[PDB]
Amino acid sequence: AQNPNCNIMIFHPTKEEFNDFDKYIAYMESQGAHRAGLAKIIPPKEWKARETYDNISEILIATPLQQVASGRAGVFTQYHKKKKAMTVGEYRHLANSKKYQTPPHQNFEDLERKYWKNRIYNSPIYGADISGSLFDENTKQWNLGHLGTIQDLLEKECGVVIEGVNTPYLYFGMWKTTFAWHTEDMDLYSINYLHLGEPKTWYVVPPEHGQRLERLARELFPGSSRGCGAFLRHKVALISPTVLKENGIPFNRITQEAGEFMVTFPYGYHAGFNHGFNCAEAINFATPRWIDYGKMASQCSCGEARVTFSMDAFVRILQPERYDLWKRGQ
Ligand SMILES: O=C(NCCCN1CCOCC1)c1cc(-c2nn[nH]n2)ccn1
Ligand SMILES: [Cl-]
Ligand code: NI
Ligand SMILES: [Zn+2]
Protein backbone atom coordinates (compact mmCIF):
# COMPACT_ATOMS: atom_id res chain seq x y z
CA ALA A 1 0.00 0.00 0.00
CA GLN A 2 1.28 3.46 -0.93
CA ASN A 3 2.03 6.04 1.78
CA PRO A 4 1.16 3.80 4.77
CA ASN A 5 2.29 6.37 7.39
CA CYS A 6 -0.14 8.93 5.82
CA ASN A 7 2.51 11.63 5.31
CA ILE A 8 1.64 14.86 3.50
CA MET A 9 3.12 14.59 0.00
CA ILE A 10 4.46 17.43 -2.15
CA PHE A 11 4.26 17.34 -5.95
CA HIS A 12 6.17 19.22 -8.69
CA PRO A 13 4.29 18.69 -11.98
CA THR A 14 5.90 19.56 -15.30
CA LYS A 15 4.01 21.81 -17.73
CA GLU A 16 2.93 18.66 -19.57
CA GLU A 17 1.57 17.10 -16.34
CA PHE A 18 -0.24 20.36 -15.46
CA ASN A 19 -2.53 20.18 -18.52
CA ASP A 20 -5.20 17.74 -17.21
CA PHE A 21 -6.49 18.47 -13.70
CA ASP A 22 -8.44 15.27 -13.03
CA LYS A 23 -5.64 13.11 -14.46
CA TYR A 24 -3.11 14.64 -12.07
CA ILE A 25 -5.41 14.27 -9.02
CA ALA A 26 -5.68 10.59 -9.94
CA TYR A 27 -1.88 10.37 -10.27
CA MET A 28 -1.38 11.83 -6.79
CA GLU A 29 -3.86 9.29 -5.41
CA SER A 30 -2.01 6.45 -7.17
CA GLN A 31 0.99 7.48 -5.04
CA GLY A 32 -1.06 7.48 -1.81
CA ALA A 33 -1.41 11.25 -1.39
CA HIS A 34 -5.06 11.09 -0.25
CA ARG A 35 -4.15 8.99 2.80
CA ALA A 36 -2.76 12.12 4.48
CA GLY A 37 -5.92 14.16 3.83
CA LEU A 38 -3.94 17.04 2.25
CA ALA A 39 -1.30 17.49 -0.47
CA LYS A 40 0.80 20.41 -1.72
CA ILE A 41 1.24 21.10 -5.45
CA ILE A 42 4.02 23.43 -6.63
CA PRO A 43 3.16 24.64 -10.18
CA PRO A 44 5.76 24.52 -12.95
CA LYS A 45 7.98 27.59 -13.04
CA GLU A 46 6.58 28.78 -16.39
CA TRP A 47 3.01 29.03 -15.04
CA LYS A 48 1.43 32.14 -13.48
CA ALA A 49 -2.03 32.71 -11.99
CA ARG A 50 -2.18 36.37 -13.06
CA GLU A 51 0.35 38.84 -14.44
CA THR A 52 -0.06 41.47 -11.72
CA TYR A 53 -1.95 41.99 -8.46
CA ASP A 54 -2.14 45.77 -9.01
CA ASN A 55 -5.46 47.33 -7.90
CA ILE A 56 -6.57 44.35 -5.75
CA SER A 57 -7.36 47.08 -3.21
CA GLU A 58 -10.65 47.87 -5.02
CA ILE A 59 -12.31 44.55 -4.09
CA LEU A 60 -14.97 45.02 -1.41
CA ILE A 61 -15.21 42.91 1.74
CA ALA A 62 -18.92 43.43 2.37
CA THR A 63 -18.96 41.79 5.84
CA PRO A 64 -15.57 41.43 7.52
CA LEU A 65 -15.69 39.05 10.50
CA GLN A 66 -13.97 39.47 13.87
CA GLN A 67 -13.04 36.04 15.30
CA VAL A 68 -13.70 36.07 19.06
CA ALA A 69 -12.46 33.08 21.09
CA SER A 70 -13.73 31.36 24.26
CA GLY A 71 -12.09 28.64 26.37
CA ARG A 72 -8.43 27.78 26.95
CA ALA A 73 -5.39 28.37 24.78
CA GLY A 74 -5.35 24.85 23.31
CA VAL A 75 -9.12 24.09 23.35
CA PHE A 76 -11.43 26.92 22.32
CA THR A 77 -14.35 27.87 20.13
CA GLN A 78 -14.62 31.02 18.04
CA TYR A 79 -17.65 33.03 17.01
CA HIS A 80 -17.81 35.66 14.30
CA LYS A 81 -18.81 39.22 15.06
CA LYS A 82 -19.85 41.21 11.99
CA LYS A 83 -18.01 44.45 11.15
CA LYS A 84 -18.71 47.32 8.73
CA ALA A 85 -17.68 46.86 5.10
CA MET A 86 -14.12 47.72 4.04
CA THR A 87 -12.12 47.56 0.83
CA VAL A 88 -9.15 45.24 0.51
CA GLY A 89 -6.99 48.38 0.58
CA GLU A 90 -8.39 49.36 3.97
CA TYR A 91 -8.16 45.75 5.18
CA ARG A 92 -4.49 45.41 4.19
CA HIS A 93 -3.68 48.65 6.03
CA LEU A 94 -5.44 47.31 9.15
CA ALA A 95 -3.61 43.96 8.90
CA ASN A 96 -0.27 45.79 8.82
CA SER A 97 -1.06 48.21 11.69
CA LYS A 98 0.59 47.84 15.10
CA LYS A 99 -2.50 46.20 16.64
CA TYR A 100 -2.70 43.38 14.07
CA GLN A 101 0.75 42.96 12.46
CA THR A 102 2.83 39.78 12.65
CA PRO A 103 5.20 39.90 15.65
CA PRO A 104 8.98 39.61 15.46
CA HIS A 105 9.89 35.92 15.39
CA GLN A 106 12.86 33.63 14.72
CA ASN A 107 11.33 31.05 12.32
CA PHE A 108 8.07 29.21 11.45
CA GLU A 109 8.38 27.13 14.66
CA ASP A 110 8.60 30.21 16.90
CA LEU A 111 5.62 31.77 15.13
CA GLU A 112 3.52 28.60 15.54
CA ARG A 113 4.42 28.52 19.25
CA LYS A 114 3.27 32.16 19.56
CA TYR A 115 0.00 31.39 17.75
CA TRP A 116 -1.07 28.58 20.08
CA LYS A 117 0.11 30.45 23.19
CA ASN A 118 -1.57 33.76 22.42
CA ARG A 119 -4.40 33.34 19.85
CA ILE A 120 -7.29 33.43 22.35
CA TYR A 121 -6.22 36.82 23.73
CA ASN A 122 -6.73 38.66 20.42
CA SER A 123 -9.60 38.84 17.94
CA PRO A 124 -8.35 39.09 14.34
CA ILE A 125 -10.59 40.21 11.48
CA TYR A 126 -10.92 38.57 8.09
CA GLY A 127 -12.81 38.40 4.84
CA ALA A 128 -14.32 35.01 4.11
CA ASP A 129 -16.25 33.27 1.35
CA ILE A 130 -16.28 36.25 -1.03
CA SER A 131 -17.62 35.05 -4.39
CA GLY A 132 -15.02 35.90 -7.02
CA SER A 133 -11.77 34.97 -8.72
CA LEU A 134 -8.33 36.49 -9.19
CA PHE A 135 -7.12 34.16 -11.97
CA ASP A 136 -6.55 35.86 -15.33
CA GLU A 137 -9.04 34.80 -18.00
CA ASN A 138 -6.07 33.70 -20.12
CA THR A 139 -4.72 31.32 -17.45
CA LYS A 140 -5.74 27.95 -18.89
CA GLN A 141 -4.21 25.40 -16.46
CA TRP A 142 -5.51 25.04 -12.89
CA ASN A 143 -7.77 28.12 -13.12
CA LEU A 144 -10.14 27.64 -10.19
CA GLY A 145 -12.89 29.52 -12.05
CA HIS A 146 -12.87 27.08 -14.98
CA LEU A 147 -12.82 23.62 -13.41
CA GLY A 148 -15.42 20.98 -14.12
CA THR A 149 -18.41 21.45 -11.84
CA ILE A 150 -19.58 19.08 -9.12
CA GLN A 151 -22.97 18.99 -10.81
CA ASP A 152 -21.46 17.77 -14.07
CA LEU A 153 -19.54 15.07 -12.17
CA LEU A 154 -22.70 13.87 -10.40
CA GLU A 155 -24.60 13.85 -13.72
CA LYS A 156 -21.82 11.88 -15.43
CA GLU A 157 -21.47 9.27 -12.66
CA CYS A 158 -25.10 8.77 -11.65
CA GLY A 159 -26.98 9.80 -14.81
CA VAL A 160 -29.00 12.45 -12.98
CA VAL A 161 -29.86 16.02 -13.98
CA ILE A 162 -29.71 18.65 -11.21
CA GLU A 163 -29.80 22.39 -10.62
CA GLY A 164 -26.91 24.34 -9.09
CA VAL A 165 -23.62 26.06 -9.84
CA ASN A 166 -20.09 25.71 -8.41
CA THR A 167 -18.05 28.98 -8.25
CA PRO A 168 -14.81 30.03 -6.48
CA TYR A 169 -14.45 32.18 -3.35
CA LEU A 170 -11.79 34.57 -2.05
CA TYR A 171 -10.35 34.92 1.47
CA PHE A 172 -8.43 37.85 2.94
CA GLY A 173 -6.52 37.08 6.12
CA MET A 174 -4.17 38.57 8.72
CA TRP A 175 -1.96 37.33 11.55
CA LYS A 176 -3.88 34.82 13.72
CA THR A 177 -6.91 34.52 11.35
CA THR A 178 -8.06 30.96 12.02
CA PHE A 179 -9.91 28.19 10.21
CA ALA A 180 -11.56 25.72 12.56
CA TRP A 181 -11.44 21.91 12.37
CA HIS A 182 -13.73 20.66 9.58
CA THR A 183 -14.22 18.52 6.50
CA GLU A 184 -15.84 19.99 3.40
CA ASP A 185 -19.58 20.00 2.73
CA MET A 186 -20.68 16.51 1.63
CA ASP A 187 -17.05 15.47 2.32
CA LEU A 188 -16.02 16.95 -1.04
CA TYR A 189 -12.47 17.73 -2.11
CA SER A 190 -11.23 21.32 -1.97
CA ILE A 191 -8.43 23.18 -3.71
CA ASN A 192 -6.83 26.35 -2.30
CA TYR A 193 -4.41 28.71 -4.10
CA LEU A 194 -2.46 31.30 -2.09
CA HIS A 195 -2.37 34.27 -4.47
CA LEU A 196 -0.40 36.84 -2.48
CA GLY A 197 1.13 37.64 0.89
CA GLU A 198 2.27 35.75 3.97
CA PRO A 199 2.00 31.98 4.55
CA LYS A 200 -0.79 29.77 5.84
CA THR A 201 -0.12 26.85 8.22
CA TRP A 202 -2.33 23.76 7.89
CA TYR A 203 -3.05 20.81 10.21
CA VAL A 204 -4.69 17.62 8.89
CA VAL A 205 -5.96 14.27 10.20
CA PRO A 206 -5.80 11.23 7.84
CA PRO A 207 -9.27 10.28 6.52
CA GLU A 208 -8.89 6.74 7.88
CA HIS A 209 -8.75 8.24 11.42
CA GLY A 210 -11.31 11.05 11.18
CA GLN A 211 -13.67 9.42 13.68
CA ARG A 212 -10.97 9.66 16.38
CA LEU A 213 -10.97 13.43 16.03
CA GLU A 214 -14.78 13.47 16.20
CA ARG A 215 -14.73 11.44 19.43
CA LEU A 216 -12.19 13.80 21.02
CA ALA A 217 -14.17 16.89 19.97
CA ARG A 218 -17.28 15.47 21.67
CA GLU A 219 -15.26 15.00 24.87
CA LEU A 220 -13.71 18.50 24.74
CA PHE A 221 -16.83 20.49 23.72
CA PRO A 222 -19.63 18.69 25.57
CA GLY A 223 -22.24 21.47 25.40
CA SER A 224 -21.74 21.98 21.64
CA SER A 225 -21.73 18.25 20.94
CA ARG A 226 -25.07 17.83 22.74
CA GLY A 227 -26.97 20.05 20.31
CA CYS A 228 -25.71 18.36 17.16
CA GLY A 229 -23.97 15.08 16.38
CA ALA A 230 -22.17 16.80 13.49
CA PHE A 231 -21.21 20.04 15.32
CA LEU A 232 -17.74 20.12 13.71
CA ARG A 233 -19.66 21.20 10.59
CA HIS A 234 -20.47 24.38 12.53
CA LYS A 235 -16.77 25.27 11.96
CA VAL A 236 -16.23 26.74 15.43
CA ALA A 237 -13.86 24.36 17.26
CA LEU A 238 -10.07 24.53 17.67
CA ILE A 239 -7.78 21.94 19.24
CA SER A 240 -4.00 22.51 19.34
CA PRO A 241 -1.27 20.10 18.18
CA THR A 242 -0.19 19.65 21.81
CA VAL A 243 -3.68 18.51 22.83
CA LEU A 244 -3.99 16.24 19.79
CA LYS A 245 -0.67 14.59 20.69
CA GLU A 246 -1.68 14.21 24.34
CA ASN A 247 -4.78 12.32 23.18
CA GLY A 248 -3.11 10.13 20.55
CA ILE A 249 -4.80 11.72 17.52
CA PRO A 250 -2.74 11.16 14.34
CA PHE A 251 -2.10 14.37 12.41
CA ASN A 252 0.42 16.25 10.28
CA ARG A 253 1.27 19.91 9.65
CA ILE A 254 2.61 21.82 6.62
CA THR A 255 2.95 25.49 5.65
CA GLN A 256 1.72 26.87 2.29
CA GLU A 257 3.49 29.83 0.67
CA ALA A 258 2.32 32.23 -2.01
CA GLY A 259 2.20 30.59 -5.43
CA GLU A 260 1.34 27.10 -4.08
CA PHE A 261 -1.82 24.96 -4.24
CA MET A 262 -3.16 22.76 -1.44
CA VAL A 263 -5.70 20.00 -2.13
CA THR A 264 -7.83 18.54 0.67
CA PHE A 265 -9.23 15.04 0.08
CA PRO A 266 -12.66 13.62 1.01
CA TYR A 267 -13.16 13.32 4.79
CA GLY A 268 -9.76 14.87 5.58
CA TYR A 269 -10.27 17.07 8.65
CA HIS A 270 -8.20 20.27 8.52
CA ALA A 271 -7.59 23.51 10.45
CA GLY A 272 -4.99 26.26 10.36
CA PHE A 273 -4.01 29.91 10.59
CA ASN A 274 -2.49 32.79 8.61
CA HIS A 275 0.94 34.31 9.33
CA GLY A 276 0.08 37.84 8.16
CA PHE A 277 -1.79 39.66 5.41
CA ASN A 278 -2.65 37.33 2.52
CA CYS A 279 -5.22 36.51 -0.17
CA ALA A 280 -6.32 33.02 -1.16
CA GLU A 281 -8.88 31.48 -3.54
CA ALA A 282 -10.67 28.15 -3.05
CA ILE A 283 -13.37 25.95 -4.58
CA ASN A 284 -14.81 22.51 -3.91
CA PHE A 285 -14.55 19.79 -6.56
CA ALA A 286 -15.44 16.12 -7.07
CA THR A 287 -14.07 13.02 -8.79
CA PRO A 288 -15.54 9.53 -9.27
CA ARG A 289 -13.88 8.42 -6.00
CA TRP A 290 -15.82 11.08 -4.07
CA ILE A 291 -19.27 9.59 -4.80
CA ASP A 292 -19.08 6.93 -2.08
CA TYR A 293 -17.96 9.56 0.46
CA GLY A 294 -20.83 11.84 -0.54
CA LYS A 295 -23.30 9.00 0.07
CA MET A 296 -22.04 8.48 3.64
CA ALA A 297 -21.28 12.07 4.74
CA SER A 298 -22.75 13.20 8.04
CA GLN A 299 -25.10 16.19 8.02
CA CYS A 300 -25.85 18.96 10.49
CA SER A 301 -29.63 19.18 10.88
CA CYS A 302 -29.73 21.38 14.01
CA GLY A 303 -29.95 24.76 12.24
CA GLU A 304 -26.43 26.11 12.71
CA ALA A 305 -24.65 24.88 9.57
CA ARG A 306 -26.60 26.88 7.01
CA VAL A 307 -25.18 25.81 3.62
CA THR A 308 -25.25 26.78 -0.06
CA PHE A 309 -28.30 26.09 -2.22
CA SER A 310 -26.02 23.87 -4.34
CA MET A 311 -25.97 21.31 -1.52
CA ASP A 312 -29.73 20.61 -1.64
CA ALA A 313 -29.50 18.47 -4.76
CA PHE A 314 -26.50 16.54 -3.40
CA VAL A 315 -28.46 15.47 -0.30
CA ARG A 316 -31.62 14.89 -2.34
CA ILE A 317 -29.94 12.47 -4.79
CA LEU A 318 -27.25 10.80 -2.67
CA GLN A 319 -28.99 10.66 0.74
CA PRO A 320 -32.76 10.46 0.13
CA GLU A 321 -33.47 8.98 3.58
CA ARG A 322 -31.85 12.00 5.26
CA TYR A 323 -33.23 14.70 2.97
CA ASP A 324 -36.46 15.69 4.75
CA LEU A 325 -34.82 16.04 8.19
CA TRP A 326 -31.88 17.92 6.68
CA LYS A 327 -34.32 20.24 4.86
CA ARG A 328 -36.15 20.99 8.13
CA GLY A 329 -32.82 22.24 9.52
CA GLN A 330 -32.16 24.57 6.57
O1 LIG B 1 -13.39 24.94 3.78
C1 LIG B 1 -13.10 26.00 4.32
N1 LIG B 1 -14.03 26.93 4.67
C2 LIG B 1 -15.46 26.71 4.51
C3 LIG B 1 -16.00 27.04 3.08
C4 LIG B 1 -17.56 27.17 3.02
N2 LIG B 1 -18.16 26.71 1.73
C5 LIG B 1 -19.66 26.75 1.70
C6 LIG B 1 -20.23 28.17 1.53
O2 LIG B 1 -19.64 28.79 0.37
C7 LIG B 1 -18.23 28.81 0.42
C8 LIG B 1 -17.65 27.43 0.56
C9 LIG B 1 -11.73 26.36 4.51
C10 LIG B 1 -11.29 27.68 4.67
C11 LIG B 1 -9.92 27.97 4.77
C12 LIG B 1 -9.43 29.21 4.94
N3 LIG B 1 -8.34 29.66 4.37
N4 LIG B 1 -8.21 30.91 4.83
N5 LIG B 1 -9.16 31.16 5.69
N6 LIG B 1 -9.92 30.11 5.75
C13 LIG B 1 -9.03 26.90 4.72
C14 LIG B 1 -9.53 25.63 4.58
N7 LIG B 1 -10.83 25.38 4.51
CL1 LIG C 1 1.78 37.19 19.49
NI1 NI D 1 -11.82 23.50 4.18
ZN1 LIG E 1 -25.56 21.29 13.83
UniProtKB/Swiss-Prot annotation:
Fe cation binds at residues 182, 184, 270. One of its GO terms (biological process) is regulation of protein phosphorylation. It is found in: Nucleus. Zn(2+) binds at residues 228, 234, 300, 302. Disulfide bonds: none annotated. GO terms for cellular component: blood microparticle; chromatin; nucleoplasm; nucleus; pericentric heterochromatin; site of double-strand break. Its cofactor is Fe(2+). 2-oxoglutarate binds at residues 126, 192, 200, 235. The modification PolyADP-ribosyl glutamic acid is found at residues 16-17. Belongs to the JHDM3 histone demethylase family. This is Lysine-specific demethylase 4D. It comes from Homo sapiens. The chain holds residues 11 to 340 of 523 of the full protein.
